[model samples]
Target chain A: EMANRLAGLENSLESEKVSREQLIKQKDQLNSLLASLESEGAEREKRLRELEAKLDETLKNLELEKLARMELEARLAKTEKDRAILELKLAEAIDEKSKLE
Target chain B: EMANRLAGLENSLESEKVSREQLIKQKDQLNSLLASLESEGAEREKRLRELEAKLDETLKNLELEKLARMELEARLAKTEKDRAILELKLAEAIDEKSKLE
Candidate 1:
């Protein structure tokens, strides 16, 4: 009976050792994976911040560009109006010159 | 002697079982952490893609705004030049009229 118990204990111990070893290997692998994932996450976060900054700057520039375009449009309108007035003055001057001639 | 050997084997088996249980618990915890990390990583990746698309769209809009501003500037320049020409012609017409009078 003691011999039988001894055999059973030995088998159980060996099985536990094997299972523990496998668990240790898996734990090591999991640790490595976690580290790698954390590093990648950090890189991704950095890139995200950079992209956000770039996008914000681009948006601000776009707003400024729109304002500049509006200003240019207003200036163009004023210039065209002035041109039209000049055209009228020129026509009147020519008509008077023709009458004088 | 047999009894002593049995006692040693039983103790060793119990210890191994306890150690294996601890390892199993640790492995379970690691698995949970890995799953959480993977989920967070996926979210970060999705946000990164969204940010990239936003930045690209903003850049395109900025480019278009710059082109529009340039076109407005060109039109303004042309109108101003036309106005200047009309001014010169009107001046000449007035001079000729004065001489004729």
Candidate 2:
């Protein structure tokens, strides 16, 4: 009976050792994951800065294009209106000449 | 000795695998964020065009204020000139070279 207990104790001891090892392995795995997260977080933090710059540039170009288009449209409409007034005055003069004739 | 070396290799391999997975996730998130920005730009452009139309109408319907409107248009052109000069200065700053407009 004592010999049986000794064998059982050895078996329990080996099983506990294996369980402890697996727990340690899991702990190590978790630690590595934490480290990986931190490094990736750093890289992503830097990328956030780059993205901010890219978006700022995008918005700036958008405003620049709007300003350019608005300026051109204003000038074109002005020229067209001026030409229209000139035609109307010329037509009035032609009418006056026809009436005199 | 061999058993210990094998465990170390396993730990290293697991750590690398998890890190790779994290990188993949971060890359995908960044890509989606970038794509979302493009949609935002389209929405912004629509609003910008609407504002342009409204401003043009405002300019047209104010024939009584034509003089002031023309001055405003002139100022817009001046703003463009300022922006261009600013860009030129930025370029020159980059290379320490002056350019003639």
Candidate 3:
């Protein structure tokens, strides 16, 4: 009976030893994963900064484009108006020519 | 001897239980961190989409602005040419008037 009890105790001790080793291995793997996650977090922050700068430049360019559009539209309107005035004067000149003839 | 071995086995079992519980807690914490990372990834994708759309719109507007500017320049050129022609005709009309008088 004492021999049986001794055998059981040795078996439990051996099993516990193996379980502890497995746990230690698992812990190391988890810590490695955590380290990788931290590095990825750092990389993500850097990308965010780059994206922010790009967005800022894009917005500024859009503003300039808006200004250019307005300026071009105004200039086009003025030119067309001026063309209409010239056409009216041209018609008057032709009228005077016909009367003189 | 058997008692010493049995006592050591019990102690090991208890330590293993504590380690397992600690590992479970660590896994839960890591899972939460993973969830946060996923949410951050989704937010980044959304920002990228918004930036891309804004860039497309800005580019199209700039193209339109360029075309409008070209149109205005051409019309202004035509008006200047027309004015020069009218000035020449006016001078001819005055010269003919002098001849008639």
Candidate 4:
């Protein structure tokens, strides 16, 4: 009876040892997976930061461009207005010269 | 002697059982940690994608704004040229009128 009990205990111990080894292997695999995921996250974050900076710069340039366009439009309108007045004056001058002739 | 061997085997089995329990607990903890990391990675990826999309849109808008600015500049230049020519014509018309008088 004592021999049987000894054999049973050794079998149980061996099974537990096997279970522990498998768990250890699984833990190592999990750790490796976690490390890979962390590296990927870090790279993605770096790209995101760079993209955000670019977007900010582009938006600023766009605002400046809009302001420049508005200024150009105003200047063009003023110059056209001036040209119209000059045309009228030239027309009057020509008419006066013709009358004198 | 057989009883002593049985007792030693039981002691060894107990130690292995305790170690196995600890390994099982550690495995559970690692699994939980991996799940959390995966969740965080997913969220970060989602944000990165959104930021990339925004950057693309902003760059396109900037390009369009630049083109508009160039067009405005061209129109302003043409209008100013026309205004200069009109001024010279007006001056000549006035000179002719004065001579006729």
Listed in order, each prediction's TM-score against the native is: 0.91, 0.43, 0.74, 0.90
Overall local distance difference test of candidate 2: 0.54
lDDT of 4 by residue, A1-101 (tens): 87888788888877887888898899899889878988888888898888889888888988898898888889889998998899898889889888889
lDDT of 1 by residue, A9-95 (tens): 888888888888899999999999989998999999999999989998999999999999999999999999999998898889888
How accurate locally, in lDDT, is each candidate?
0.91, 0.54, 0.71, 0.86
True contacts kept of each: 0.93, 0.00, 0.26, 0.87
lDDT of 3 by residue, B1-101 (tens): 87776677778778877877787677667767767776876777677667667667766766776776677667667866776676676667656655655
Deviation of model 2 at B57, angstroms: 27
Comparing 1 and 3 by TM-score, which wins?
1
Best by lDDT: 1
Model 2: chain B TM-score relative to the native chain B: 0.52
Q: Candidates sorted by TM-score, descending order?
A: 1, 4, 3, 2
Cα deviation of B51 in candidate 1 (Å)?
1.2
Pick by DockQ: 1 or 2, better one: 1
Top candidate when judged by TM-score against the true structure = 1
Give the range of the ten consecutive residues with the poorest summed lDDT in model 4 chain B. B7-16
The predicted structure with the larger DockQ, 1 or 3, is: 1
Report i-RMS for every model.
1.6, 21.3, 3.2, 1.7
True contacts kept of 2: 0.00
- Tell me the deviation in Å of residue B23 in model 1: 1.3
Q: What lDDT tens digits, residue by residue, belong to model 4 across residues B4-75? A: 888888888888788888888888888898899889888888888888898889888888988988998898
**Candidate 2 interface CA RMSD, Å:** 21.3
lDDT of 2 by residue, A1-101 (tens): 45554555556555655655665565566556555655655555465555556555655555555565567667756655555555565555445555545
